[PDB]
Amino acid sequence: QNPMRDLKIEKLVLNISVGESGDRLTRASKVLEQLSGQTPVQSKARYTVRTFGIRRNEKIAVHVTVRGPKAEEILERGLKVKEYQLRDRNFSATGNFGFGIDEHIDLGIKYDPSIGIFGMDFYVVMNRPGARVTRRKRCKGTVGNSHKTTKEDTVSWFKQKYDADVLDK
Amino acid sequence: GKSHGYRSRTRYMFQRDFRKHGAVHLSTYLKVYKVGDIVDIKANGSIQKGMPHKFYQGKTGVVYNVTKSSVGVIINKMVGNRYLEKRLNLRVEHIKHSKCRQEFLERVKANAAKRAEAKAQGVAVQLKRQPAQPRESRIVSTEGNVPQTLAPVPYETFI
Amino acid sequence: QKDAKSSAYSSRFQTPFRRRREGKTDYYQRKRLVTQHKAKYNTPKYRLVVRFTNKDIICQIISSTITGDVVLAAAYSHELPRYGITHGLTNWAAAYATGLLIARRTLQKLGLDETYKGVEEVEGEYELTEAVEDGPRPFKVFLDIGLQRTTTGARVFGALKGASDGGLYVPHSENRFPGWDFETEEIDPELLRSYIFGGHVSQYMEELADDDEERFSELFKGYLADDIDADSLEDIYTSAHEAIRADPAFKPTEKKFTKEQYAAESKKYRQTKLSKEERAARVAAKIAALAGQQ
Amino acid sequence: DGDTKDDVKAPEGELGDSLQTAFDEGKDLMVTIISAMGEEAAISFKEAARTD
RNA sequence: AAGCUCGUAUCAGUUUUAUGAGGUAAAGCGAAUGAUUAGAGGUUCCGGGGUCGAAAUGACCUUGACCUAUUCUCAAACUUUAAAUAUGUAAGAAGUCCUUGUUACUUAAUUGAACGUGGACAUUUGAAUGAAGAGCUUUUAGUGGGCCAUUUUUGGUAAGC
RNA sequence: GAGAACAGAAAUCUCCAGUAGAACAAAAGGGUAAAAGCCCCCUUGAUUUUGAUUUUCAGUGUGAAUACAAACCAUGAAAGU
RNA sequence: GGUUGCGGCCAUAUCUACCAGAAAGCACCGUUUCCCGUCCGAUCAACUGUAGUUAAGCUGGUAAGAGCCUGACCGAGUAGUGUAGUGGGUGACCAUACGCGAAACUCAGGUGCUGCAAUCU
RNA sequence: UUCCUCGUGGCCCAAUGGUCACGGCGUCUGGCUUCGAACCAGAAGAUUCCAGGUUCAAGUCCUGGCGGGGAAGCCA
């Protein structure tokens, strides 16, 4: 049936893929903490490509994990930026979803010229409670077949809550 | 140039097994070895420390020393026209009791039992083992087992 | 579709033994634990195994044999009501009490209870059970924490301190006990003693009692229902400790039933195997219907 | 990395004279050094003027 | 060659019983790696293309990949499996069982470990056959270019190579 | 394999599958999955005293390696190493 | 008989897809002052067992299931191999005498057993 | 047969593992001249002869192939 298999948000991951490190990197990092209240982390590159102009461990991008009512708050504050409409393919086959935005100034920080202008990449990881069965150390196991999310469940949940709509397909 | 290392020509001899990789089961460490036990040697390729040299693989010897993690073994090696005894030190992972003895002393205590029991009435206990004697006479009936006549088979290609 | 593994893969697959499949034992740790100095031939190695499940605590003394493990004595948390503890069966102090219980239980069944009395005037000091002169060199045992994460102030070490004060000799440093100052390498006995007597709980009463009442109600509900006050929390533990030192002899339950009756009901309740003759009939009928043009 | 090497003393070679001629207007002087058996001198010149 | 200590043994180019180890012969590739002939069915948001097409995350063909199920043949430096012949050890007196003595080692502990006192069990005393005596020491000559035959096998087309 | 602005075949992030098909200074072969692989914290046992043993072997040397003893240490809560 | 803690042998125990599970246990599950650790109380840390649910974990069952294990005068006494001949054949190779003896393939059966302690209508 | 060497802008060549890489001649646009040269301002162009391994990066580091050139070949 459906006693306690309700769907809830685990986490919102905010990514900014700056193509290089340096001052602009610092300026990009200087964005997230106002939006989150957390200390951001800056991720290194894993191999050279020499055409994008990056060396190994050149520390190119930044991302942040946010969970809880704070997370769903930021999610809501982003959905208005997308005017509560997302194209179908944005929804992962495992029940997760995400989207990218431009001009992080469309919320919170007016402009604050020392920062400049940056875009982001909001992503949402979605499942049901009781998921620590795959994260605990002792007696680690896998979640059952009937208890996993899916495209059909996640779309319907995204309609029923936030009363939004999905595009062509 | 030629090449004779410490582990030369051991490509297959030290491969572990099929579907028996990974750690060693604890029973080896739970084994207890006394001085005078006779024991075989089979190198475990997953424990590089305290390995036996490839020549001693599949040999059997006598324990003469016990330490915290290893066992001293005596092996007889043929060199030239005589034997020389070699003294080894082997971690227990390359070690397992020779069940030949374990079988043997069962005979010893069994013969003790038979000897005492038969001594209680003096009936010539007859302890010694005997080889397979030629089987004694017997009679075979054909009742419901009438003999079947056979014949050679002709040639057919069968392809 | 994608959820398919080839026969070659399944035929070349290695499985963990059984316990590594269930994710319950660290065989890498078991190596270092159960291995015995080969010059000490049959002298077994005894382990103080401690596990922490929900609503219960388990403490045992286990040695190992080829055919399986063997236990000397065990002490569970849910028998504290015998000794005057009814709530918080998994807190730090409850762990310390259990460690004390199993300590006196073992020394009582080993005959080492009159000697090596242990520590009575507990003060949170770091001291080991030293050997009495020309005596029986007190019993020795090691921790087996399993997959549990070691960390400063963890309740697994409460059992350690319970045994050490109980009279067992358990080798250990002190730099993981709660109250271990970090930037300077010392210990705070006052804070450790408080934890031994639930200080972090009795103290935690006062804030909720003075800030939020429904919160003070839903949890700690049993305390209100049975009229236990914050200040009174040390006393019940102190009264318990004497009960443990009085009689650790592990009075068992009466079971109010029999083994056979329990078997009878489970036997009649569980689903059984299906015989080959039935299986063959079942498939034959499946052909007769599905393939038989329905 | 470093600010060192008050060494080589700027070889008298005419290629080095041309190097010194082309020096004063700049454009990112690249110079090579040969240091066999310790005794060392600057032998070759090159240009890499990008700064982008 | 000189012998010495002893008198049927602390033996054996042998078999049997029991128990170990091996990766060759063989075999395998719709089993891991590599090679390799052939068609078949799908799959292109995704190869090259063409036709209907302005295009489409449109349709139809063709060629190359990709995947799925099949097919023919292979490996000294591939392999699941795996011989024959050769090969390690044991078949008691230096043994077995019972009791309690030593120790500065070990054990929570006279618990263990090793070595012993005393007592009990002999010619069926622990498979076969043989034993022409068994064991031990010294000293020194000559030799240190090999070749042939069966079987296994390397380079080479091959050789009285 | 499936998804996210610039970002595309290759930039960063997330989920699912994943017996090792990666990695372990180097040539190759063994060995390794709560590790021997990656990241982090503390250290110097890469220390002193000579012995015994394995390989090559004349049972010489050299090189390399194994298991101890008597000290002083490192690490870990501990067994241990 | 069920369950938990510690295990022994290490797939008959693994994998895929469904179904069932009284009681207890286990589990998910609630909270952030203290000890503690992270970008994030998600893991780890601490407190309550109270607010709830067998949905999942787990256990068991089902499948002319994959795999795995055992066996058979199925294949086969075949391939291979030790010893012998003044055996055959120009030769490659092949039979005979005394012995040992496979693998692939086919068919049939099975789908964890068990030690110690504790608890359970 | 061996050994060695070489192959890069249209031509001749140079090359530091760290920038798609350098010179000279050549080519293109504009200027001067009635015009072409010479002259004056500026530009552009290279899968480093074909496949792999290393490196973080390879013309370069090296291994496997194609084309060219040089040396050797004596005592009988």
Ligand SMILES: [Mg+2]
């Ligand atoms: Mg093998």
Ligand SMILES: [Mg+2]
């Ligand atoms: Mg560990």
Ligand SMILES: [Mg+2]
């Ligand atoms: Mg070989």
Ligand SMILES: [Mg+2]
């Ligand atoms: Mg063959």
Ligand SMILES: [Mg+2]
């Ligand atoms: Mg085969």
Ligand SMILES: [Mg+2]
């Ligand atoms: Mg192959």
Ligand SMILES: [Mg+2]
């Ligand atoms: Mg044999």
Ligand SMILES: [Mg+2]
């Ligand atoms: Mg002479």
Ligand SMILES: [Mg+2]
């Ligand atoms: Mg001589």
Ligand SMILES: [Mg+2]
């Ligand atoms: Mg000589």
Ligand SMILES: [Mg+2]
């Ligand atoms: Mg000569």
Ligand SMILES: [Mg+2]
């Ligand atoms: Mg580790």
Ligand SMILES: [Mg+2]
């Ligand atoms: Mg040597």
Ligand SMILES: [Mg+2]
């Ligand atoms: Mg011009």
